[PDB]
Design a protein around this ligand. Structure first.
Ligand SMILES: C[S@@+](CC[C@H](N)C(=O)[O-])C[C@H]1O[C@@H](n2cnc3c(N)ncnc32)[C@H](O)[C@@H]1O
Ligand SMILES: C[S@@+](CC[C@H](N)C(=O)[O-])C[C@H]1O[C@@H](n2cnc3c(N)ncnc32)[C@H](O)[C@@H]1O
Ligand SMILES: C[S@@+](CC[C@H](N)C(=O)[O-])C[C@H]1O[C@@H](n2cnc3c(N)ncnc32)[C@H](O)[C@@H]1O
Lengths: 1024, 98, 347, 50
């Protein structure tokens, strides 16, 4: 790289072909003097935010507008303005055609100065008739104006072989121009006089003229292809004001405009389209004794020389210039910083380097010198700006061989974080409530009521209430009561009686409702009543009439449901009343209130019917009371569980009241209660480790989000410190998804990196010894403008896929199986090893896949070994030392890749594993455990050819049964202890999926379990 | 005054436009090139010889019978001053008694 | 055939006149989306392949493909414009895939990686790659060929065996041919290399089918004929493109091809003079029986006619044929009393 | 009426201790917030220049 604002290194370009000039004849002057609708000598400029015409750029025939705006008196609107100009130029056209016959003056060149001054005098009514004899030129363009005798000092005057002429009005200001921040800058070329261009034929005569003439503001040359002959331009002392924070003067604005125009022209060079001029830069010639170093005129002379040599700006410029952009560019150029380029602005001549791509030396005889001394090390190419995105995009790292200490990267990321901020939280658990049910069977088991479990004693503590309130605040639903009622009715109308053969509950039922609440942001009733009455559930028949009781009715009556009350006898009755409101926060009064609700709901049941009771706090007294009283008077029952919010509440449904029978509790109910309570314990232990709902993050939380935001000026090889900081963030993140965003923030190009941490990430940070470093090339190439978004904690809003959920299940099985301080080996990790986040920190690993990896070699505390030699083959496992081998989601892939059967692939695997020294092992096998349901859209089997056909991935794998798998295992080892681990109904595997900040599902976790039952994981201990 | 952005047009439109008139329409300096340094070489210092400095613009005349016209920076300046003072007196909130 | 016998780039390839010809042809050739037309061509010629092992074909529906070298800006969606019509089946010569993921330096709905050396990802059953050797290669054939070798290595190791891949090659040189013949062809069941022709350059596509099976494949004389035809086609069309004028030129008469007009006036009904007849007949001798269009209109108070036509090197040959300049019959222009409004000239 | 009649202020603009006549805000909320955005952008350019 940079001078004071960053220019684009590593490339430089310039246009090549220059158009041959064209003499301006009288027919061209007439065709420009009338205004065709296709082309006219003015182009309108327009505002950027309003699309309003606020300025007019002028061209060749009308460029002599040197007088004040009041002398002309143009109308302010653009349409009336251009109509006025067309009419008055048509009058001037008739005048000049009346003077000169076209048929005899068709093919002679006309005089440009007289043309511009004639238009400017006719628009100002300033005695233009003495210009008409000078319109046709002879013997050259300049000597007629020198040796003429017509006295007119408003436009030109001669000093003896040096003509001066007052140029003016490249642009024209309209009425609605108001110095707005999206107005186009006019570069002080709309005033009466911004410069006085002095024309001659030879630069020696010009330099002799500027001995006695002053050079206060400094003169400017052109040297490439000037407008009307070889000349200097001296700007006056007027100011430009349409750039807010600082005011520049005239020649500063001219040099700035031409430098920016050449910066525009250097990018758009395509080596086949021609330009009208190779460089438009000025290269100041005499005023350098007055404007010195660190001034803006000197710095723009430096940038003018760099533009002539052919450099490019590091940031792209707009097609239409704005005052904000011009202000930002000049505010970048007046700053601190040295000139890093070897190009220094000279005084005798404009210099160009040895390998600069400009070919201006060949098309110009005087001005340019190919300096063989200084060289430019950068290569030659054009600019390639990549197209920006509005959303942040994902980034993946690639590592290198170098390494540093961990605490240095920790200190650097602590310098670079913007971590004390408040992220948006998201949602833990999305979808419909999961349903867990069990029903009475006559032939299971009789158990006593004292053997069934109860609530844990540490239930009403602060951390437990914290976990339950966090899960209830983060879990997103519609209506809790609606989802619970749909679940309990769909699982209630499946029951059949042992007395008759149809079912218990039918249509036309005349039900009762207990515990009604009014407010549900809809009707003033629970939201299941009218769809269940209209039959919209379509798993139910509609009842005959629904009456609703409870403390908070709107279309019923308020009673106390504990002790009885005047009412009828209802054939079915549903209760939703809880033991929280009337119970005074103790289990004794809560259990007695449960007993009273059971008494009232039994006496209000109209015998030969059914009832549903909810129980918040199932305790031993409740189980003993219901086993002593309710079960002898009930034909059959079931107790189910809709799972929407993490609590221990269950539902009790009894069928066939007031018949004498003998019913007890069963071992299946015991298993259901153990599963229910252990599920609550695991999910509460997960929920007590998350941060709160609306927290700010400080870094001390074991899970959360962290960002850094370091800046990158243009194209530049980033330093050591940025690389250490980003690599330390990568070591802190541990191969989660990482998203970046590149945007200009407060006048600085800066990039952010947003990702999340986990306890598995902390385990991986405990694995390694030295901090490795990334390859920064994938970030150095990026030249986009990636607009950021506010950070969220749970990014996945659609939920997790069942393949991901199945992968987390197998990962939890591996992390539960692997003990501490044990040698392991894995078959088929991939380019990244997920098993590094699973095994403990002291345990060494040696994994193998047929594909080369991306995890870094070296810099670990314990032994890690990466090798790629097609593990299914033979002759490699002799030197390999391990205690347990793991093959996850890869044996079927290898069997499909070798196009061989699953039994033969498993036999080849066990033949190559007999040579190892391991004793325990667990691998994933493809085996049907239950009867096949051939899952629609996720796993559609082939019964004949025995393939799997995953439709989401487009792959299929062979399989065989556990009989054949056990046959080959017992043929391999006679003393092998084969076992099959069951699935987790208790959701114990959800630790890795929630602590790594992923919203799971409901339907996809159901599909993931029903997919796991068709491809389980077996464990082999070859001893015992 | 040096930074025109710091005057808001809603509070001070009159002061903002008077500042714009000063920044844009104030007279420019020029030169006349007197003397000769052939005999009595010029005693100019910090300026080149054979030049004078004038705080207003100078174009030279073309005739010897002078008449009146309205095209120079001083009459332009008087016109802009009268234009702002009529914009000031046309407002009724600044002189409600008139 | 041996890999040393196949031709390569000409050495006069990065010169100023060659870049001039390629940039002229690329600026003048009018299309919609370059990448869209190239992708439709390569997919329609890719899904015609059949395997020798089974009998159906290589590529089918539900494929789970990968995309390399994604670019965002295409004046439409922020992806290459073949992805959603190929996913919806609008091409109707293809079956739709199951899922498309896109990688490269300039993704918008994917991830940015360096495609040279590997990176954490899955294994994709098909993979189409465009990564080119202009951006990362520092304008030399050695680093360009090594980058081709690295892209071939990454695209072979990311292929999920039993599948296929498509690789583009900008600069096919002898080292590239030797490397692909030594490494890729023993591990590939069958292949094809095709060429969509939209812009005048020597870049080709390489498509391989059936990765990671041990076989023995070499190059053939038909491939040799195809490469000779390809390089001679580039040489002829570059020699044509180096003789045209530039894109936005002004004409001075020194160009061997271009446009020329005259505009002489005719007052009313009049037998035109000797000089007008000589001038129009000289324009006819300079044009040499191309199409010639006229226009008669009043210009600035004068009735004038123009004659617009074009010249050619064949016209210059015909101008070199003859000895004396013949003269036309001006009657067909003297009869005309219309007002034929002109238009701006085009080349 | 669901009409904006008052504005609660926050951390950066909380030093408005002078009289309302000294500031002279417009009465309508949209013109008010547009005026505040413009004038705070001017103040932003000043403090970034410092
Ligand atoms: C059962 S829940 C509301 C469930 C809601 N009706 C639904 O199903 O969507 C809470 C309600 O139980 C009622 N309730 C609690 N204890 C009660 C008691 N002893 N007698 C009657 N109503 C009771 C309260 O009045 C409260 O409105
Ligand atoms: C889908 S992956 C399974 C690994 C990882 N759990 C995953 O899901 O990506 C399939 C892996 O099996 C490995 N693989 C397949 N066949 C193999 C063979 N014959 N020898 C060694 N590795 C093989 C491949 O390298 C590939 O990484
Ligand atoms: C392959 S070409 C052009 C591809 C074309 N835009 C398309 O959509 O098919 C150059 C593009 O490849 C991308 N790219 C990704 N990785 C690359 C690598 N290693 N080398 C070169 N280019 C790479 C660049 O971002 C660049 O935009």
């Amino acid at each position: 790289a940079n001078v004071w604002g960053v220019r684009l290194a590593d490339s430089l370009s310039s246009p090549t072909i220059e158009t041959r000039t064209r003499h301006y004849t009288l027919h061209d002057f007439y065709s420009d003097l009338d205004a065709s609708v296709g082309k006219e000598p003015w182009r309108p400029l327009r505002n950027q935010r309003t699309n309003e015409i606020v300025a007019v750029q002028l061209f060749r025939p009308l460029q002599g507008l040197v007088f004040d705006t009041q002398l002309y008196g143009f109308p302010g609107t653009f349409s009336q303005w251009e109509q006025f100009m067309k009419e008055k130029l048509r009058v001037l056209k008739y005048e000049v055609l009346r003077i000169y016959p076209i048929s005899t003056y068709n093919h002679d060149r006309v005089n440009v100065f007289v043309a511009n001054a004639l238009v400017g005098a006719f628009l100002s009514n300033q005695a233009f008739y003495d210009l008409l004899p000078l319109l046709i030129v002879n013997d050259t363009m300049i000597s007629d104006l020198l040796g003429t005798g017509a006295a007119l000092s408003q436009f030109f005057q001669s000093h003896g072989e040096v003509l001066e002429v007052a140029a003016g009005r490249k642009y024209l200001q309209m009425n609605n121009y108001s110095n707005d921040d999206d107005d186009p800058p006019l570069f002080a070329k709309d005033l009466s006089d911004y410069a006085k261009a002095f024309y001659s034929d030879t630069y020696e005569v010009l330099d002799r003229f500027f001995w006695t003439h002053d050079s206060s503001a400094g003169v400017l040359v052109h040297y490439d292809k000037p407008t009307n002959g070889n000349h200097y331009i001296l700007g006056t002392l007027t100011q430009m004001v349409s750039a807010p924070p600082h005011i520049i003067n005239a020649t500063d604005a001219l040099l700035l405009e031409s430098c920016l125009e050449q910066f525009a022209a250097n990018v758009r060079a395509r080596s086949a389209q021609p330009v009208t001029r190779l460089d438009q830069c000025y290269h100041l010639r005499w005023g350098a004794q007055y404007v010195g170093e660190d001034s803006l005129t000197y710095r723009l002379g430096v940038l003018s020389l760099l533009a002539t040599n052919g450099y490019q700006l590091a940031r792209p410029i707009p097609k239409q210039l704005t005052n904000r952009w011009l202000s930002s560019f000049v505010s970048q150029v007046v700053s601190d910083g040295i000139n890093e380029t070897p190009l220094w602005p000279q005084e005798r001549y404009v210099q160009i380097a040895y390998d600069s791509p400009s070919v201006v030396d060949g098309a110009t005889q005087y001005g340019y010198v190919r300096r063989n001394q200084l060289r430019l090390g950068m290569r030659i190419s054009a600019l390639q700006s990549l197209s920006d995105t509005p959303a942040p995009v994902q980034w993946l790292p690639q590592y290198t061989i170098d390494q540093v200490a961990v605490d240095e990267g920790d200190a650097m990321v602590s310098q670079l974080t913007q971590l004390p901020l408040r992220p948006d939280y998201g949602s833990i658990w999305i979808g419909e409530a999961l349903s867990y049910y069990v029903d009475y069977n006559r032939s299971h088991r009789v158990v006593l009521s004292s053997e069934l479990p109860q609530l844990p004693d540490t239930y009403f503590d602060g951390d437990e209430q914290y976990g339950r309130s966090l899960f209830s605040l983060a879990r997103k639903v519609g209506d809790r009561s609606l989802v619970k009622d749909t679940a309990v009715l769909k699982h209630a109308y499946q029951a059949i009686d042992p007395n008759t053969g149809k079912e218990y509950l039918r249509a036309g039922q005349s039900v009762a409702y207990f515990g009604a609440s009014a407010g549900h942001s809809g009707a003033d009733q629970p939201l299941v009543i009218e769809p269940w009455m209209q039959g919209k559930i379509s798993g139910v028949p509609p009842p005959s009439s629904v009456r609703q009781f409870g403390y908070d009715v709107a279309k019923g009556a308020i009673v106390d449901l504990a002790r009885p009350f005047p009412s009828g006898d209802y054939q079915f009755v549903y209760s939703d009343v809880d033991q929280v409101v009337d119970g005074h926060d103790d289990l004794s009064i809560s259990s007695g209130l449960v007993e009273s609700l059971l008494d009232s709901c039994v006496h209000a049941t109209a015998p030969g019917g059914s009832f549903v009771m909810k129980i918040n706090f199932p305790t031993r007294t409740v189980w003993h009371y219901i086993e002593q009283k309710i079960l002898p008077n009930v034909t059959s029952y079931m107790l189910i569980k809709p799972f929407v919010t993490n609590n221990v509440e269950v539902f009790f449904v009894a069928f066939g009241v007031h018949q004498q029978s003998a019913l007890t509790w069963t071992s299946g109910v015991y298993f259901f209660l153990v599963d229910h309570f252990y599920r609550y314990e695991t999910l509460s232990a997960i929920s007590r480790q998350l941060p709160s709902f609306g927290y700010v993050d400080d870094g001390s939380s074991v899970t959360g989000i962290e960002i850094i935001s370091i800046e990158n000026p243009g194209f530049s090889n980033m330093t050591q410190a940025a690389r250490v900081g980003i690599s330390g963030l990568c070591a802190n993140v541990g191969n989660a998804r990482k998203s970046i965003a590149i945007y200009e923030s407060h006048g600085a190009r800066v990039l952010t990196i947003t990702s999340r941490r986990s306890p598995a990430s902390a385990r991986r940070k405990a694995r390694l010894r030295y901090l490795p470093l990334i390859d920064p090339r994938s970030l150095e190439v990026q030249a986009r403008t990636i607009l950021p978004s506010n950070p969220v904690l749970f990014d996945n809003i659609n939920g997790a896929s069942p393949h991901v959920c199945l992968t987390m299940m197998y990962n939890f099985e591996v992390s539960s199986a692997v003990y501490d301080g044990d040698v392991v080996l894995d078959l088929g990790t991939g380019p990244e090893a997920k098993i590094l986040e699973l095994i403990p920190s002291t345990s060494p690993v040696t994994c193998v896949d047929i594909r080369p990896t991306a995890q870094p070699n070296g810099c670990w505390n314990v032994r890690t070994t990466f090798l790629e030699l097609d593990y299914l083959s033979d002759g490699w496992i002799t030197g390999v030392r391990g205690d347990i081998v793991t093959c996850m989601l890869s044996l079927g892939a290898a069997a499909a890749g070798k196009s061989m059967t699953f039994d033969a692939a498993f036999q080849q695997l066990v033949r190559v594993l007999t040579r190892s020294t391991a004793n325990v092992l667990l691998i994933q096998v493809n085996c049907p455990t239950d009867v096949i349901r051939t899952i629609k859209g996720y796993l559609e089997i082939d019964q004949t050819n025995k393939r799997y056909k995953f439709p989401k991935f487009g792959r299929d794998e062979p399989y065989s049964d556990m009989d054949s798998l056990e046959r080959i295992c017992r043929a391999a080892w006679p003393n092998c202890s084969i076992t099959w681990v069951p699935l987790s109904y208790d959701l114990r595997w959800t630790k890795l999926a929630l602590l790594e900040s992923t919203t799971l599902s409901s339907a996809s976790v159901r599909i993931a379990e029903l997919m796991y039952k068709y491809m389980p994981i077996m464990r082999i201990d070859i001893h015992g | 005054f040096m930074n025109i952005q710091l005057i808001s047009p809603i509070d001070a439109p009159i002061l903002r436009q008077w500042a714009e008139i000063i920044h844009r329409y104030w007279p420019n300096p020029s030169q006349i090139r007197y003397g000769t340094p052939n005999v009595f070489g010029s005693a100019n210092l910090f300026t080149p010889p054979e030049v004078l400095l004038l705080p207003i613009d100078h174009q030279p005349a073309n005739v010897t019978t002078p008449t009146l016209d309205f095209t120079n920076e001083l009459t332009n300046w008087r016109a802009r001053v009268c234009e702002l003072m009529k914009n000031l007196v046309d407002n009724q909130r600044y002189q409600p008694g008139w």
